[PDB]
Amino acid sequence: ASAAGVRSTRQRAAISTLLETLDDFRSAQELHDELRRRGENIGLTTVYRTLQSMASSGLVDTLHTDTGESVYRRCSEHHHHHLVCRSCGSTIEVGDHEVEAWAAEVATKHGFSDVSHTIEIFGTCSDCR
Amino acid sequence: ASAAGVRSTRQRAAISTLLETLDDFRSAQELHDELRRRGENIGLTTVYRTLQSMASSGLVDTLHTDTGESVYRRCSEHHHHHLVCRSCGSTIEVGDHEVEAWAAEVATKHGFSDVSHTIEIFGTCSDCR
Ligand SMILES: [Zn+2]
Ligand SMILES: [Zn+2]
Ligand SMILES: [Zn+2]
Ligand SMILES: [Zn+2]
Ligand SMILES: [Zn+2]
Ligand SMILES: [Zn+2]
């Protein structure tokens, strides 16, 4: 409620804030540890759960490292597109020099000004089977 | 009205029907001529106007040949994507072997089943400036 529900949203805001400052993918462990170093007192279970909400509402992007651990980043600022899981919303960052190249030339081919494009991929994720 | 508005929709239906049977891009002239050969009595102005409505509501796709003439086809049945004019809705067919290739591998890369994708391009057309 007021001791709990206001302290809850205050935790999330602290997680959100740490992300805005990080430029690279980080595990939930690494993110918990840096919050701790920064004076926060936020349990690892709460961190993992928050990053999951973020990773499936499209605020953070995710990857699975050769370990098995999920890593996270606030959406990347440099132009890219996303792969998304239909079932849980898990968002993965995707791109390509030579796809983005195709999309540009084909517009100026037919003589179009003010070009823009949307590329989206979807599927049922590994976890979701 | 009943002599006019019912005969009007009857004309469009005859144009729509000819398209369902043609597999290749054809000018408004060529399409008028074949309607005529098929027993219809539909003026060239009405044909040109119908194909324009179709070309910008997304029923036919369009191209501009080295002459300057617009050519038209009912949407192609083989998998492709579209370029579209923001201003008039002019729909042009676009595709690529090596774009479609990228989209598939990147999904089965991260271990996704039941893959699908949407690619859309947009811009202000040559006619529209
Ligand atoms: Zn992203
Ligand atoms: Zn792009
Ligand atoms: Zn999933
Ligand atoms: Zn088409
Ligand atoms: Zn495709
Ligand atoms: Zn236009």
Side-chain angles (χ1 to χ4, degrees), chain A residues 1-15 17-19 21-23 25-48 50-52 54-72 75 78-97 99-104 106-112 114-123 125-129, chain B residues 1-15 17-19 21-23 25-48 50-52 54-72 75 78-97 99-104 106-112 114-123 125-129:
Chain A
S2 281
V6 105
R7 190 259 289 154
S8 168
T9 59
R10 203 261 295 144
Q11 270 168 351
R12 191 186 214 89
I15 296 158
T17 288
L18 171 67
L19 295 176
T21 82
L22 294 162
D23 271 325
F25 279 92
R26 299 294 284 182
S27 70
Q29 192 57 66
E30 285 160 354
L31 289 168
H32 159 280
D33 293 9
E34 184 56 17
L35 285 162
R36 180 127 151 262
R37 206 190 67 83
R38 288 188 186 178
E40 298 312 304
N41 176 14
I42 299 158
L44 163 70
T45 304
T46 293
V47 180
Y48 176 80
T50 303
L51 294 165
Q52 293 305 80
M54 289 165 162
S56 73
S57 67
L59 292 145
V60 314
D61 292 356
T62 211
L63 277 154
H64 284 99
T65 75
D66 283 54
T67 73
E69 248 149 300
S70 283
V71 281
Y72 311 87
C75 205
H78 295 281
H79 175 106
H80 64 269
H81 308 281
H82 306 112
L83 174 57
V84 191
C85 191
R86 295 199 200 79
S87 274
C88 63
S90 189
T91 324
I92 290 175
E93 175 175 344
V94 294
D96 202 75
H97 164 289
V99 160
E100 203 84 6
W102 166 77
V106 281
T108 338
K109 214 228 100 185
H110 291 102
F112 267 40
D114 296 16
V115 187
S116 63
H117 71 276
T118 80
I119 296 161
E120 285 169 336
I121 312 179
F122 303 109
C125 88
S126 180
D127 213 55
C128 266
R129 281 178 306 283
Chain B
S2 281
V6 105
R7 190 259 289 154
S8 168
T9 59
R10 203 261 295 144
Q11 270 168 351
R12 191 186 214 89
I15 296 158
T17 288
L18 171 67
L19 295 176
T21 82
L22 294 162
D23 271 325
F25 279 92
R26 299 294 284 182
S27 70
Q29 192 57 66
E30 285 160 354
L31 289 168
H32 159 280
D33 293 9
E34 184 56 17
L35 285 162
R36 180 127 151 262
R37 206 190 67 83
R38 288 188 186 178
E40 298 312 304
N41 176 14
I42 299 158
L44 163 70
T45 304
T46 293
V47 180
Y48 176 80
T50 303
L51 294 165
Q52 293 305 80
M54 289 165 162
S56 73
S57 67
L59 292 145
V60 314
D61 292 356
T62 211
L63 277 154
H64 284 99
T65 75
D66 283 54
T67 73
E69 248 149 300
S70 283
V71 281
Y72 311 87
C75 205
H78 295 281
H79 175 106
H80 64 269
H81 308 281
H82 306 112
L83 174 57
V84 191
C85 191
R86 295 199 200 79
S87 274
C88 63
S90 189
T91 324
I92 290 175
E93 175 175 344
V94 294
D96 202 75
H97 164 289
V99 160
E100 203 84 6
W102 166 77
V106 281
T108 338
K109 214 228 100 185
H110 291 102
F112 267 40
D114 296 16
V115 187
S116 63
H117 71 276
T118 80
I119 296 161
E120 285 169 336
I121 312 179
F122 303 109
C125 88
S126 180
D127 213 55
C128 266
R129 281 178 306 283

PDB file of all heavy atoms in Angstrom, chain A residues 85 87-90 125 128, ligand 3:
ATOM      1  N   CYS A  85       8.704 -12.679 -28.891  1.00  0.00           N
ATOM      2  CA  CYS A  85       7.934 -13.872 -28.559  1.00  0.00           C
ATOM      3  C   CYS A  85       6.445 -13.579 -28.390  1.00  0.00           C
ATOM      4  O   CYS A  85       6.052 -12.793 -27.529  1.00  0.00           O
ATOM      5  CB  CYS A  85       8.470 -14.564 -27.302  1.00  0.00           C
ATOM      6  SG  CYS A  85       7.711 -16.192 -27.112  1.00  0.00           S
ATOM      7  N   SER A  87       4.274 -15.340 -27.033  1.00  0.00           N
ATOM      8  CA  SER A  87       3.699 -15.898 -25.818  1.00  0.00           C
ATOM      9  C   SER A  87       3.988 -15.148 -24.522  1.00  0.00           C
ATOM     10  O   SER A  87       3.112 -15.031 -23.675  1.00  0.00           O
ATOM     11  CB  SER A  87       4.105 -17.355 -25.696  1.00  0.00           C
ATOM     12  OG  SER A  87       3.194 -18.140 -26.416  1.00  0.00           O
ATOM     13  N   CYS A  88       5.216 -14.649 -24.379  1.00  0.00           N
ATOM     14  CA  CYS A  88       5.640 -13.930 -23.181  1.00  0.00           C
ATOM     15  C   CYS A  88       6.113 -12.485 -23.436  1.00  0.00           C
ATOM     16  O   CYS A  88       6.293 -11.720 -22.481  1.00  0.00           O
ATOM     17  CB  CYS A  88       6.763 -14.700 -22.492  1.00  0.00           C
ATOM     18  SG  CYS A  88       8.239 -14.844 -23.480  1.00  0.00           S
ATOM     19  N   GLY A  89       6.337 -12.127 -24.701  1.00  0.00           N
ATOM     20  CA  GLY A  89       6.736 -10.763 -25.063  1.00  0.00           C
ATOM     21  C   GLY A  89       8.244 -10.490 -25.050  1.00  0.00           C
ATOM     22  O   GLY A  89       8.690  -9.359 -25.325  1.00  0.00           O
ATOM     23  N   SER A  90       9.026 -11.515 -24.718  1.00  0.00           N
ATOM     24  CA  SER A  90      10.487 -11.440 -24.736  1.00  0.00           C
ATOM     25  C   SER A  90      11.013 -10.726 -26.010  1.00  0.00           C
ATOM     26  O   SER A  90      10.793 -11.196 -27.130  1.00  0.00           O
ATOM     27  CB  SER A  90      11.060 -12.862 -24.621  1.00  0.00           C
ATOM     28  OG  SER A  90      12.461 -12.870 -24.432  1.00  0.00           O
ATOM     29  N   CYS A 125       9.070 -18.601 -28.460  1.00  0.00           N
ATOM     30  CA  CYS A 125      10.460 -18.703 -27.978  1.00  0.00           C
ATOM     31  C   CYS A 125      10.839 -20.064 -27.359  1.00  0.00           C
ATOM     32  O   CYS A 125       9.979 -20.920 -27.110  1.00  0.00           O
ATOM     33  CB  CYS A 125      10.808 -17.539 -27.034  1.00  0.00           C
ATOM     34  SG  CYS A 125      10.418 -17.822 -25.313  1.00  0.00           S
ATOM     35  N   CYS A 128       9.445 -20.765 -24.219  1.00  0.00           N
ATOM     36  CA  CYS A 128       7.986 -20.880 -24.364  1.00  0.00           C
ATOM     37  C   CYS A 128       7.439 -22.201 -24.918  1.00  0.00           C
ATOM     38  O   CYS A 128       6.230 -22.461 -24.807  1.00  0.00           O
ATOM     39  CB  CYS A 128       7.415 -19.711 -25.153  1.00  0.00           C
ATOM     40  SG  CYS A 128       6.857 -18.428 -24.079  1.00  0.00           S
TER      41      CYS A 128
HETATM   42 ZN    ZN C   3       8.316 -16.739 -24.929  1.00  0.00          ZN
END
